[PDB]
Design a binder for this molecule. Structure first.
Ligand code: HEM
Ligand code: HEM
Ligand code: W0T
Lengths: 453, 453
């Protein structure tokens, strides 16, 4: 159709547009200007950004499109390896690990993780109970402490003890710096230029630090013989029904690194955005707090009680609507095909699904798309197909969805039961972009309702 | 016959002997060489160090000798003011505060503080329970986190939240640096030399940090009118029966600063030395652990149970015997008098009581003074008057004695109930001197007995 394309910079084509610390937000504005589809070129490379439910519903057809590793994911793959998130669907270790780990991530398995989630959630509540009169909370910082700890504990019985520290754990320093370097590689003609030798040296170091530390966690567990009901145990013992094979220790390492990435990056952002919207929308906070008080009648919340926090669940979905914390996923055409009746694609052609824009499609949600209204999610059946994709699509959808939502619902429920919140700075949303999105500098004050634990 | 005296440095006399990281330990070595008394001279001053029970019992006759402010304490007074610890006996505010505060520090008052002591103690135990299998504990660091927080919470319902951070609370950074400066001023021949301009700027800044926080806490409490179970409440409401006056806000601040200093410095040291002696003497550890397990039958220890920890109390007293954490106190002759039928003293003459040396007086304790044997304290009746003085003397004895011993007995009891301990490094005692003595670099491993809290 003579596809729309944003401004170009001679031989660099569109690449300079991503030379910014907020590339996703830049892409969202481009989508606002250009519409449901735009081409994005750089030297030697092209992708097409999709923003409408009309086109994205075709992109979600697994017979036509499969998951692609974006350039960022190809760089994350240098340390996340062939774990689930950075593997191609056709790689043997993808379907093997997928089949082995699904049972570990089901709604049923959440019952088993619940106690350990409560352990970390209570540490959060206690921290906040123990703050003095005039003190405030650094929201994304504390949400990250929580979610990292939760996956460490539930994942491999390891306590990061984030609420005991200011300094991040050695693994995290390397992980964050690796993630940063992976995103920075996306703006470099001549990667072999000696000006990046220190960047490369640091990256290799960081890779080796994560490996050495995770490999030791594996080794120690094999050595102890302990059978704690966690992801590491299920990976050590599990066999893929198809091949009959277990995961090898290298792949297990990559899965653990992957889970730590997820638990540090994604769920913490969700909790941070949810709290942000609640303090910006007092009527919604009140309704959520009402439910929390009504449902969480015991000092320790139970698994069943978390399932009964329906409005808290809707609040989280609405937070995921506006700011899906992993904001884009990539696809490639399995064969030649035509998108939307108008855009012919060849086998191998790539697409990027711009999730925050999909979630702002006024044809789907109505004109009030920027408003925070959890009630939009009262009935999944009234939401059109492929309109809401915060956890991606199909067989390559987020394996951690049930875990993330259970943790987030539990913690947000507890938070709303135990405290009233003040937006004491009238915080202005400022979204930092790493692998994920987070509200940087978001702070609040929390006044205890003095309900015992 | 002339009074013994250590080596001299020309015009500086004995002063350079205290130009060392470990002055008290240097003075103990000198005492060992020279005996029960030696003179120590510096430019413009003289003092006499006493090591024997026979001379010290006379020095402790309050009709003949009163508390002196050592050079060190005069410098500490720049921030502790006319608080109890740094006031002269004849100053109006000493007796006034003493009368008001004595009931707040009694054995009976410990019933009121017990619950908040437990609050912090449980945080210590949770921290250690949450360590990963082969991580270790930094003993004085964690004991200092505990004792500071306990006196903060019991003293003025303020949470330093030391177990939530690596870097000390700003107030503590200032207090430590002020205490360090106060000790450092002692060696400067020309204090107004421009080389100390920064030291003095920093000292004043540190004093202001301390005054600001404390004055604010006092102001906030008076504004709100709330009534807590803390020393601050008692000081705001208390009246001295003698003068009929309450303490004013400035003196209240000095008392609070004083209590914070004491909690940070002294009790933490006692706990660290006790654990040191315990891991070096496993028979004693076993005997103390048996008592802890037998007595502390509830997840939350009670006041009544802490009082039953007789042997844990003996352990603490024997640790105080070998390493009394505030190791020296100073006296002055009220009038002309003769010490020991041998050494004439003029009115105003200063004496220093070397407590560690008193506690090694073989004429009182037997020849095995260096051995750690809590059974020495099996029957308190046996201990001669003035043989054991870790809490000083008479009306100027430590007002916090019952507080310190309650906290230490509680915490050590809980530690011995909940963990086994390993001296994994075969630690060599290395004693750091600030205001007090503490074992620097003492580390252990603690293996949980998995007893619920
Ligand atoms: C609010 C929280 C989370 C969000 C928004 C989120 C989002 C996503 C999205 C959008 C994808 C698809 C990526 C793509 O198509 O390239 C994905 C994949 C994945 N997520 Fe998450 N995620 C979250 C939490 C978690 C957690 C807690 C874990 C693990 C403990 C996890 C593990 C994974 C894995 C392993 C994949 C790859 C699955 C596969 O392809 O087989 N996620 N996630
Ligand atoms: C094991 C712990 C402790 C030891 C070994 C200890 C030792 C001492 C000693 C030896 C003195 C006499 C000082 C002198 O003669 O110049 C003293 C005085 C004092 N201590 Fe402690 N102390 C401890 C804990 C505490 C605590 C926890 C507090 C307060 C919370 C405290 C508050 C004081 C005060 C206010 C004085 C001055 C008393 C007065 O002269 O009226 N001490 N301490
Ligand atoms: O890594 C990629 O392949 C694509 C597109 C791209 C990056 N460089 C290009 C050069 C030519 C053509 C396309 C590109 N990168 C992006 O869209 C982006 F801007 F970096 C991005 F939006 F931040 C992102 F990386 F895709 C993303 F949205 F943040 C993400 F994929 F969700 C993330 F995983 F978070 F990185």
């Amino acid at each position: 159709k003579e596809m729309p394309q944003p401004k170009t910079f001679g031989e660099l084509k569109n690449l300079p547009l991503l030379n910014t610390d907020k590339p996703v937000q830049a892409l969202m504005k481009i989508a606002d200007e250009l519409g449901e589809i735009f081409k994005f070129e750089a030297p030697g490379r092209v992708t097409r950004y999709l923003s409408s439910q009309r086109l994205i519903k075709e992109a979600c057809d697994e017979s036509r499109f499969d998951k692609n590793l974006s350039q960022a994911l190809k760089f994350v793959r240098d340390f996340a390896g062939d774990g689930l998130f950075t593997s191609w669907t056709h790689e043997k270790n993808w379907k093997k690990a997928h089949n082995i780990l699904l049972p570990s991530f089901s709604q049923q398995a959440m019952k088993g993780y619940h106690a350990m989630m409560v352990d970390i959630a209570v540490q959060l509540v206690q921290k906040w109970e123990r703050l003095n009169a005039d003190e405030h909370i650094e929201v994304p910082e504390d949400m990250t402490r929580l979610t990292l700890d939760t996956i460490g504990l539930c994942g491999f019985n390891y306590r990061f003890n984030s609420f005991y520290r200011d300094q991040p754990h050695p693994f995290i320093t390397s992980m964050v710096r690796a993630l940063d370097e992976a995103m920075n590689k996306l703006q470099r003609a001549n990667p072999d230029d000696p000006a990046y030798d220190e960047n490369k040296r640091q990256f290799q170091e960081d890779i080796k630090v994560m490996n050495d530390l995770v490999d030791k966690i594996i080794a120690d567990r094999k050595a102890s013989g302990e059978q704690s009901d966690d992801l590491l145990t299920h990976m050590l013992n599990g066999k893929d029904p198809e091949t009959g094979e277990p995961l090898d220790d290298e792949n297990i390492r990559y899965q653990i690194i992957t889970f730590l990435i997820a638990g540090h990056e994604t769920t913490s952002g969700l909790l941070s955005f949810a709290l942000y919207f609640l303090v910006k929308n007092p009527h919604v906070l009140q309704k959520a707090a009402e439910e929390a008080a009504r449902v969480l009648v015991d000092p320790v919340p139970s698994y069943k009680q978390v399932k009964q926090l329906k409005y808290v669940g809707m609040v989280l979905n609405e937070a995921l609507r506006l700011w899906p914390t992993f904001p884009a996923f990539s696809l490639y055409a399995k064969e030649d095909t035509v998108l939307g009746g108008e855009y012919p694609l060849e086998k191998g052609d790539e697409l990027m699904v711009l999730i925050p824009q999909l979630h702002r499609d006024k044809t789907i949600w109505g004109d009030d798309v920027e408003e925070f209204r959890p009630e939009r999610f009262e009935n999944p059946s009234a939401i059109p197909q492929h309109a809401f994709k915060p956890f991606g699509n199909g067989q390559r959808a987020c394996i951690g969805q049930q875990f993330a939502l259970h943790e987030a619902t539990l913690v947000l429920g507890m938070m709303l039961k135990h405290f009233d919140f003040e937006d004491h700075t009238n915080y202005e949303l400022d979204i930092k972009e790493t692998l994920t999105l987070k509200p940087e500098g978001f702070v609040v004050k929390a006044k205890s309702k003095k309900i015992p634990l």
